[PDB]
Design a protein around this ligand. Sequence first.
Ligand SMILES: O=C(O)CCS/C(Nc1ccccc1)=C1/C(=O)Nc2ccccc21
Length: 135
Amino acid sequence: GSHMCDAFVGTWKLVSSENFDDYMKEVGVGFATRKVAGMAKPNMIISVNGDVITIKSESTFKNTEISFILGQEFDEVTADDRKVKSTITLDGGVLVHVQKWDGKSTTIKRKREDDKLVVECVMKGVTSTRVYERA
Ligand SMILES: O=C(O)CCS/C(Nc1ccccc1)=C1/C(=O)Nc2ccccc21
């Protein structure tokens, strides 16, 4: 039957980005990767099978995939090639994705708002908002 994470499932396309270069700088992404990753217009494909959530991200820059169970840490290699330890939870309808590496932390929050899936990436005081719509 239904689950609350149902509203995330589907194929989503990036429609706007704000402050992503500055977020990438805060994370430590180098110049060339910032330029190429910032140019990307990813699709994000979200599916659920039992307790396992899969999020794919596909662009001309990189194709990545993670599968995970809520609350259960996993190792992730990010599109910019960080080796992080990640935990994803639901918090009041928001998917909260925390990445830890080298004594640093960044959080990506994903929520449904109207017909959008809004992705907020935060590193210290810097936030980037990336808006996706159904493909
Ligand atoms: O999706 C967006 O438009 C914004 C986030 S891109 C992303 N980081 C990231 C950070 C710096 C440079 C390039 C990419 C992701 C990451 O680190 N883990 C993910 C799992 C699923 C989907 C995306 C990401």
